[PDB]
Structure 1
């Protein structure tokens, strides 16, 4: 009743952020209120998201909660790098962890700080999308 599946997901994400679970790497946490995302504003979605991310998000039950989750994941990954968000691509699969790819200036910026691997976790509900990006050097 009290501990919904969103609070489990976010408590597991913040459990893997502590120094004991992982240390010596770039850590970025971004939250996004889903109400901030406007899916009808096609200029924001085309600018800041890849066509594959838009195709994935549009096929989800809650479209706005998926775009808020992907937007939070891009902003978490950009904070983890520590250096337009279309450069960072998040390939999310059903009942699977999302994977991070860097294409344009983010791919250069990751090589500048000697960042090889970047993982991301996402938890999104009817209020907020929280994303935690851990970048190993």
Structure 2
């Protein structure tokens, strides 16, 4: 097993910063977040989900500045978040015996938060 939690300030996401966004979010994630009622809040929630998922893997960090594009949040019933690992995240997870990851997201004025649980 494994568990992850992450909390983010809504203002931590600068929607105007295309470089930051493009480096850390897949085109699909960007399309989803850009279409929500509160775009900044949606990106913040997705960012929290990426971090929560990473923490649940039980692996080593590549460094404070490594992009999280490899951890992709996809949707199920249109809006519910599912996890898809790619690249290094996929390798590291498989190397750790992780067979599945579930995630949930929520936000309010204070911050966005996400919780992930992984199965081995």
Normalising by structure 2, report the TM-score.
0.89
The whole-number CA distance in structure 2 between the counterparts of 1:113 and 1:125 is 33
Runs (5+) with no aligned partner, structure 2? 60-66
Q: Is the Cα contact below 8 Å between 1:30 and 1:132 reproduced in 2?
A: yes
Question: What's the CA shift string for 1:91-111, capped at 9, x where partnerless?
Answer: 135664311001100110111
Q: Offset of 1:36 from its aligned partner?
A: 1.0
| Higher share of residues assigned strand | 2
Q: Offset of 1:128 from its aligned partner?
A: 0.7
Q: Does 1:98 align with 2:74?
A: no
Question: What's the CA shift string for 1:49-75, capped at 9, x where partnerless?
Answer: 000000000100100000000000000
What residue is the counterpart of 1:9 in the other structure? none
The whole-number CA distance in structure 1 between the counterparts of 2:72 and 2:93 is 14
The whole-number CA distance in structure 2 between the counterparts of 1:120 and 1:129 is 13
Which structure is richer in relative contact order (CA contacts within 8 A, separation 6 or more)? 2
The whole-number CA distance in structure 2 between the counterparts of 1:77 and 1:120 is 7
Greater than 2 Å deviation, 4+ residue runs: 92-97
The whole-number CA distance in structure 1 between the counterparts of 2:21 and 2:3 is 26
Runs (5+) with no aligned partner, structure 1? 1-24
Normalising by structure 1, report the TM-score.
0.79
Question: What's the CA shift string for 1:7-50, capped at 9, x where partnerless?
Answer: xxxxxxxxxxxxxxxxxx10011000101110001000000000
Query: Which one has the largest radius of gyration?
Result: 1
Q: Is the Cα contact below 8 Å between 1:73 and 1:132 reproduced in 2?
A: yes
